[PDB]
Design a protein around this ligand. Structure first.
Ligand SMILES: C[C@@H]1C[C@H]2CN1CCn1[nH]c3c(cccc3c1=O)-c1nc3c(cccc3[nH]c1=O)O2
Length: 290
């Protein structure tokens, strides 16, 4: 695009390369994403109006010469990078709680307009120097079906995928994003991925080994799911005190509700914001080197 000048390749999203670039017009630095059916066009345009402080802002959509470029506000780094860097001492609890609180606000907003992210993961959570965190690539999934492999052939991570998606439910709800965020919450606290599956069945079985194999008791209708197999091994449910120490009682109570098997029992983003865990929530400034 004539109006932009690439500064550097800052990443590789699911749909295309992402560059940090400068707008020759406004002089603003931005994140340029390379990705055209009419349906995707209408969908992307809807995204230009769902603005929230905790959602990476979609500045412009350039559909030129049968190509799609999405211009997004630029945010210095992602959460994955910050997490790896904080592997030795871990992200202090006050900051973890602040990030979770902000993410829940971003989700509550999106879910109120019936938009789901569908693919939340540390990598698409962006953080700035002022203590804020924002959801990136929000809504791109419905527009462009999230594939098994990226344009670069990298395997899309299954670690944050909700069980209903894994079991074949085709009309999953906003609850899938709460599941993902819960997995991220646990990972920030323990400094280790909660369910690092490397295939759909390994992903499903890791979930089962920690939370117990779901049945009609905890999840009515589960046995009727498309990919549910009566032959799934029967694992006992582990205790959360063992899964996410040293997270306190309120935190464990909240995480448990975010990880409920039944999508209808799983806590909503809105209800999560009123949880006592956030009673003493604050907004501290992180220690990140740019
Ligand atoms: C955000 C995820 C991960 C990587 C590829 N992304 C996936 C593709 N992608 N990248 C996006 C960005 C901003 C806004 C929206 C998107 C987006 O959808 C930016 N992306 C990135 C980044 C990695 C390290 C720093 C920045 N900074 C950014 O500003 O992208």
């Amino acid at each position: 695009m004539e109006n932009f000048q690439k500064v550097e390749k800052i990443g590789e999203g699911t749909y295309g390369v992402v560059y940090k670039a400068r707008n020759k017009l406004t002089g603003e630095v931005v994140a340029l994403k390379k990705i055209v059916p009419s349906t995707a066009i209408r969908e992307i345009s809807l995204l230009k109006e769902l603005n929230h402080p905790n959602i990476v802002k979609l500045l412009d959509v350039i559909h030129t010469e049968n190509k799609l470029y999405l211009v997004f506000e630029h945010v210095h780094q992602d959460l994955k990078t910050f997490m790896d860097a904080s592997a030795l001492t871990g992200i202090p609890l006050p900051l973890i709680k602040s990030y979770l609180f902000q993410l829940l606000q971003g989700l509550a907003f999106c879910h109120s307009h019936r938009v789901l992210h569908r693919d939340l993961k540390p990598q698409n959570l962006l953080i700035n120097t002022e203590g804020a965190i924002k959801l990136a690539d929000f809504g791109l999934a419905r527009a462009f079906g999230v594939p098994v492999r990226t344009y670069t052939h990298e395997v899309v991570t299954l670690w944050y995928r909700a069980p209903e998606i894994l079991l074949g439910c085709k009309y999953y709800s906003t609850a899938v994003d709460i599941w993902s965020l819960g997995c991220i919450f646990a990972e920030m606290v323990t400094r280790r991925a909660l369910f690092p599956g490397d295939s759909e069945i390994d992903q499903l079985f890791r979930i089962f080994r920690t939370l117990g194999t779901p049945d009609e008791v905890v999840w009515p209708g589960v046995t009727s799911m498309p990919d549910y197999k009566p032959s799934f091994p029967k694992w006992a449910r582990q205790d959360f005190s063992k899964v996410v120490p040293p997270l306190d009682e309120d935190g464990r109570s909240l995480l448990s509700q975010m990880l409920h098997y039944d999508p209808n029992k799983r806590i909503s983003a809105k209800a999560a914001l009123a949880h006592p865990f956030f009673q003493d929530v604050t907004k501290p400034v992180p220690h990140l080197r740019l």
